[PDB]
């Protein structure tokens, strides 16, 4: 069986970055040249692996994490980065092994008047650990008065919609991102090349 990368890359809808999706790939064969040859990917940056060598090894696990962010935020999906997305939404480890793949999705994910379906976390007390996911919607206390789950001054809903509009500049346009993590442990190695 072919690895179901089409289900990931060609999915009709993507996850919000704060609620980023993870798909485990296993028990299948992949041709990674189908991905890295593509003129569609404006980002294709690998760490610890060369994409032209991914076909050379059977892995024990491949994970595909996917979500939508702004074009100006794709740079945050890299080891060692900081900012709202790296700190509070999706965090790669300092010594990540895998590839970060992104493409402009303005034609799919922007809407007249703003797409409110894609959200990010604006407020969080502390930074995420690598590969941590926070989907909570507790009202965020920015002042000394407790919020008791009620929004108001100094008491904020922690998530925010991107509101993608098709006429935005490219830095404000939505980008679909897929992060491929590659692992080889002392376990069955079932994710193979051609």
């Amino acid at each position, epitope marked *: 069986n072919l690895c179901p990368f089409g289900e990931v890359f060609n999915a009709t809808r993507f996850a919000s970055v704060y609620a980023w999706n993870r798909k485990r790939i296993s028990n299948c064969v992949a041709d990674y040249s189908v991905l890295y040859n593509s003129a569609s990917f404006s980002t294709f940056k690998c760490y610890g692996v060369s994409p032209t060598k991914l076909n050379d090894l059977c892995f024990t696990n491949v994970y595909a994490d996917s979500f939508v962010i702004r074009g100006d935020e794709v740079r945050q999906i890299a080891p060692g980065q900081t900012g709202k997305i790296a700190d509070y939404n999706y965090k790669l480890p300092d010594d990540f092994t895998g590839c970060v793949i992104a493409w402009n999705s303005n034609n799919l994910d922007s809407k007249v008047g703003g797409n409110y379906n894609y959200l990010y976390r604006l407020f969080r007390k502390s*930074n995420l650990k690598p590969f941590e996911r926070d989907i909570s919607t507790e009202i965020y206390q920015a002042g000394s008065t407790p919020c008791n789950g009620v929004e108001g001054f100094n008491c904020y809903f922690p998530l*925010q919609s991107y509101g993608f509009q098709p006429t935005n500049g490219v*830095g*404000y346009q939505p980008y679909r991102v897929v992060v491929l993590s590659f692992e080889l442990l002392h376990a069955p190695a079932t994710v193979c090349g051609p």
Partner: single-chain antibody
Amino acid sequence: VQLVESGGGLIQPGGSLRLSCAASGLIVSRNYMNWVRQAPGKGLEWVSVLYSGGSTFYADSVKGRFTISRDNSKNTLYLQMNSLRAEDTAVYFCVRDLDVKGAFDIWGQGTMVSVSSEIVLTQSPGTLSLSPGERATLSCRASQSVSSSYLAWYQQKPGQAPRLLIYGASSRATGIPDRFSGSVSGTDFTLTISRLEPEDFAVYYCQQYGSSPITFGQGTRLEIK
């Protein structure tokens, strides 16, 4: 809620200063806290930010010279300023940022420091002279596209900190009268005052916070004809 700055002075070039900003009502460690500066007779310049989670960012012109920090137990923000230059002369403001949820809404009173790429926002006219009761239109044009969610207008009276008028291009801040309105048409971002009151004569600044660094227009002086 209040922010109280201190630590400024008149210092020789090459010296150091440490600014302090004591907060009440808001918690420094829970907020995007910023330093913004204003040189004598000039506009506003973003200097530094400290995230609740600890990340820090700086304007290129102060990198390697200034350091932002906080003391949670003292609910205080600091700006350590080393290797001071004549160009660092400004009033320095401590400011809380709500970003798309409310922009720079809380400002301190400022502390004076005297020593002796980015989206450009162009405001027009430089000076706007009109009579009370008239409609005023003020323009702000960006050097590249800025989504409407990331635009704000401020009013500054003499000797005071700027006051947020409008954020997200068209959302009035709390307590701002409805004669103030904001709109975007093309690359032009406009502030309209439908009927000028005597208290409306002030300096007006636009701001974008969608691309780093945060930048401000050079200001429009609204004066009586």
